[PDB]
Amino acid sequence: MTSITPVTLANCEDEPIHVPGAIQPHGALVTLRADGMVLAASENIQALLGFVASPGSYLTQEQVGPEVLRMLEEGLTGNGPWSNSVETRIGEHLFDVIGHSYKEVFYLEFEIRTADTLSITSFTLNAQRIIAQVQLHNDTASLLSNVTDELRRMTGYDRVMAYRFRHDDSGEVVAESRREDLESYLGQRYPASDIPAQARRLYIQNPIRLIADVAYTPMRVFPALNPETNESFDLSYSVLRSVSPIHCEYLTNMGVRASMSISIVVGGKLWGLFSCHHMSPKLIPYPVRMSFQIFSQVCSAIVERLEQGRIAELLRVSTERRLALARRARDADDLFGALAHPDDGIAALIPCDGALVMLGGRTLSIRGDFERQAGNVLQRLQRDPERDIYHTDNWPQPSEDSPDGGDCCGVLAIRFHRQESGWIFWFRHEEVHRIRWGGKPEKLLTIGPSGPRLTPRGSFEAWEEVVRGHSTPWSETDLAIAEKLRLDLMELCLNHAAEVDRMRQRLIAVLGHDLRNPLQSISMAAALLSSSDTRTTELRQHISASSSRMERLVSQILDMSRLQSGIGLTVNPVDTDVSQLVRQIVCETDVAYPGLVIEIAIDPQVRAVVDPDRYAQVAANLLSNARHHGLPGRPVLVTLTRQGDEVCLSVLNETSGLSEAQLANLFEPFKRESADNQRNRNGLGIGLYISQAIAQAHQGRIDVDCRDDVITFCLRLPVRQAETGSSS
Amino acid sequence: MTSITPVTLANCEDEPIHVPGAIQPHGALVTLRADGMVLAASENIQALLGFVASPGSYLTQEQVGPEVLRMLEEGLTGNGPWSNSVETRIGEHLFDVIGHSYKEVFYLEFEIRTADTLSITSFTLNAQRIIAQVQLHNDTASLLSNVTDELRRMTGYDRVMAYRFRHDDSGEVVAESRREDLESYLGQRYPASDIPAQARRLYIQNPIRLIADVAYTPMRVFPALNPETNESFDLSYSVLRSVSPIHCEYLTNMGVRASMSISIVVGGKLWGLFSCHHMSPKLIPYPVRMSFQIFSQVCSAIVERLEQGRIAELLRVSTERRLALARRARDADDLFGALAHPDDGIAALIPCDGALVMLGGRTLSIRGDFERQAGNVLQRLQRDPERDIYHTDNWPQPSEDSPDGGDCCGVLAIRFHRQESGWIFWFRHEEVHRIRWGGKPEKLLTIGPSGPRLTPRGSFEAWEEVVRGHSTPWSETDLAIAEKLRLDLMELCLNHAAEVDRMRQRLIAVLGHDLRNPLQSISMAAALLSSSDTRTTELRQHISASSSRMERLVSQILDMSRLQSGIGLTVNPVDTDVSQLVRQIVCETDVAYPGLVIEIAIDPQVRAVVDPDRYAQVAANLLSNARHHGLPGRPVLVTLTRQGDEVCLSVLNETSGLSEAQLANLFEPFKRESADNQRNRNGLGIGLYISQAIAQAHQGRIDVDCRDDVITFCLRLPVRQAETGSSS
């Protein structure tokens, strides 16, 4: 739907190995339609089976015999997936005829069992042999060790190996059984490109491969495209499927002449393989490969059980320490203390060569001194501040320019208090690794008539690569522990930091209560001054003005605290003459500010049940806002009107132009722009915030209209009558 | 007389089905010691085999034939667990002699293969198909359906059913293949008591059961106890093991005459069964049950992998939805609004008939009104305040006694901000559930002369239970989503509330600056009052005193905020004559409060480099504390001494007795005891906190010594050496 077609990232995953259009010549293939019509067949069918499977026809009993027709008939007419096989003699050779269905196409694959003993061993006896062996092991090390030997005994292959994939898709030969005169491949690494993603995905679906003769010439199955869809025949589940010519080249470079492999699937991912080699052609009869296909799933389930148990036990053991630390830190007076102890603490949660706890600008290093390393990592994290977890095993080793460089190649950092910079770091020193590679990893490129070819390595001689500047990698367990600790510490930091709010509530509330009395006393004393002398009169006036200003500030503080605390404003609606109140406020404002030209259009005797103190407060806030933000010398128009069940008071004044962002933030508290406005340098900006809260408390609202740098405010309050109680 | 009185939990788990001491008479059993000696044998051994296995004797080739001893010798001399079988003829008919070892006891189980023919063993081909075909299913719903049909066609049983266990160990018939005339059991429920915990564990250990004749007579094995241990023979892995008579009664009441069942084990738990029934005796040859053991292990592994895939996909889609919400909630100005939107938000994470989001007293419902249920849940949860998550599927609906009830049956709640009461409640309305029980699940007991007996149900006719008042239970995924979202919202609350803190800091920081000017103006005007009249003089004095008190409060506010914000107290250390300062302060305090007897022991010319304003503040704080907490009329002893490079000021006064908690909390801010002290009602209690912080800022300390209700404070401040120019 995005109208885009991405391009693949790697050319090694782009071979369609599942639709080769060819089979290995040790059998014959026939493809059949859901009604039984022959669609395509392998070109050797006349030589191997003695008859021509002409497309469009149906198999005759003279051709495949009654056993194959009985099997096919039960297949085509059956329901759900189909997979069956039967033993029959066609011509003079005994054949294993395998049948399966995939994506509505039915396949019949014939393998010769010439020069072999009839029913020498059955699928059930071999399956029980292996499953009984596999179930004796409680560790994957010994499970893979013994299974590799039993598989070599049963098959008789020149070599059998257990190959385990790494987290980076590479893999290592973790177990081996081999003929004495063969060089051991145990413990060698092989790169991720040796088994491409396409194969790993396929080998989760079809657990068994066999290559009977690595020198084989593919037999083309023609027509190559299914006539009913023009699509290639999907041979994913075919046993005769022609393997990639690049892998037969890879095995020719190993000197291998037959191959077999069995998948190990864990968690829906290809966990490993059992790979078998022979230095001469070798075919394993289908009943035995069927027993191996059964074993593949039993062994996969057992390995999964073992790995899940081991991981679960490590997770439990670590959860114990994490919870104990959480308890200690919760009980301790200082978290930055309880975590920063060289005994236990966070340094003991994850294997590290030292750790550092950082919070609120306080740091402590455990088992070393890493404030330098930590600070430098933060100076790296400053480029991606939204990142909360950082882990690395290849920290750039410092240059020789100064000995201040720290060789702590491993860093694992987690942020538990983003605003206070709560950081925990775990460090690891450089661990010098040595890797035995199965052949030098030369590039997959050769140029010839085909252009560049993805040719495999020319030799598999064990090459030893020394790794420097790398530490012990942080396991998925360590990363999980680090994240769970991050969350546990965030929760504790929130519970800890939330107490600051309660303290400020108590403090401010007591201050608001205790400060009113001295101000009231001063205002009363100023009112009691006889004002006999002109000097005494001026001082009395200045004292009364300053006291009223402080009372106003204290009132604003109380209101803001009550609003932020959610208590709201306790309004007392009473029948108030809005006309008289607004006219009085305007007159007092004009007399107080003779330079402020105030125009009034106040309807007479507008009476409404409203709180006179809150309405006066709103009017004062609006006049102050118009004075501070209005253009100097411009007149202010005040219009009070009753619009049905609402009282509308409008104030219009010119401005130097207000942006839409400023208009949206007009009601925001502590607006930074107020500190820069030379006329409002002392304005807290809460005037609109408090006014809006007052309007909401009165079930009203404050409208704002700014046009052509002229802003118009319209207070709308609902008309209501106060309730009166009676005994009736 | 044992001083104990146990209480029975259940009768059905007590019967030891693994040590029955008897076998099903379709075979014979011989028990052997690790040295090959015969321990015990079934009493029918002479009837079926023609020889007597006298205890203590050894088998002989003329008795059991050579192939039996050949098989047994590999067992006795083998390592670890053993399990094998041999096809051999004894007397005139063929026996399937199966051997295994358990707890170092070796068993020989003889099963007659009479009345069949190797051609009938073609069941091995149907086994091959089922084992091979099962691997291709894409989901458990189709897998159970197809496998039940294949199992019925293969075995030919009158009925086959896939039984899946519920989370409460009950089970439901989820698939069925049956003879056309038989009553279909598909979809019926059966209680947990139908397969007791012991049977579930044994069926996890021994996957295949077969009751060839429900009407059988148990063939006792004699002697019943192993002479080597005097214990019962553990027959958990014996194929001839006599099934519980309570279960054979159960099958008799179904009209079943033979049974077979195949375990499905997932995650090491019994996930389900395939149970096959026949209305007449039927026996499955041992090679076929051997193939069913393989099928059971393969099916178990595939079912486990399919269910893991389904759970993983559910967790993936859940994670996508949750992280999308966390993003929207983080980009929002108000978290509450971005969560509370009905069109998109929290309500899409967990399927609910409605939801309520709550934070800081706000409550916004979605798809209805839910404040009643939320209120009742919190009122209940207030009795478990540490609880952060709650879930229920059967909330008690309100009685008709009041219309204020809330009719929601299911509630899921999580707390994401313990202080702001941030709660998210997901509600589910009544989902009337109709349950079809396979017979009424009445009590499985009847009392007779032997007391209560574990009588099965006498009938299996479907009884429909109308379960009312229950909603869809909260699945493991719904709980995982609630648990993870709780953390995703705790993160956002912490990161946002840090801004609320920073805002209140900015608020108080601006208030402290703007309040200073009006106070200074009033203090100056008061100082300018000519005080010509006595009344004018008294008013001036009152105004000056009130202004000084407010200035003191404002200073305390600034100090407290700077300390809580970590800014500390700014000090200006200067060479000050401590003797003169302290003497002056004491004189002023005594003159202002002649009723407060102050005793002074002030060393002369004590000089120290200290901030005179901060040190005077500390002295005033100490004197105020002694005045408010000292006993009325008792003298206060003030001692100032220089102890080398430190100046020590001590104040001693009598008290009404201070508790150890009050002494330890003497430096705490907002000490509740200050609000209750009628003499210190206006005291915030910060005096000691601020004084201690000032002392620390001066690199000094405040010592406290309270003895026999007499408290002694000792301020220790370091003396700083003076610096001056010098020349030769």
Ligand SMILES: C=CC1=C(C)/C(=C/C2=[NH+]C(=C\c3[nH]c(/C=C4\NC(=O)[C@@H](C)\C4=C/C)c(C)c3CCC(=O)O)/C(CCC(=O)O)=C2C)NC1=O
């Ligand atoms: C001792 C160690 C050891 C290892 C590590 C090993 C690997 C291995 N690769 C396998 C698969 C494939 N590899 C490639 C391609 C490439 N392979 C490369 O090396 C580069 C150059 C490249 C392309 C540019 C393809 C297309 C396939 C799919 C084949 C198919 O199914 O058609 C398989 C499974 C097949 C089997 O059973 O042998 C194994 C077992 N066999 C060993 O004996």
Ligand SMILES: C=CC1=C(C)/C(=C/C2=[NH+]C(=C\c3[nH]c(/C=C4\NC(=O)[C@@H](C)\C4=C/C)c(C)c3CCC(=O)O)/C(CCC(=O)O)=C2C)NC1=O
């Ligand atoms: C159509 C539905 C349907 C269901 C649900 C069903 C259940 C079932 N119970 C099983 C096992 C046992 N049950 C009990 C005991 C109790 N069972 C009850 O009902 C009450 C009366 C009671 C005790 C108070 C015991 C001791 C055993 C162990 C038997 C042994 O191994 O010796 C088995 C496995 C055995 C088998 O293959 O048939 C199944 C399959 N059989 C069905 O055909």
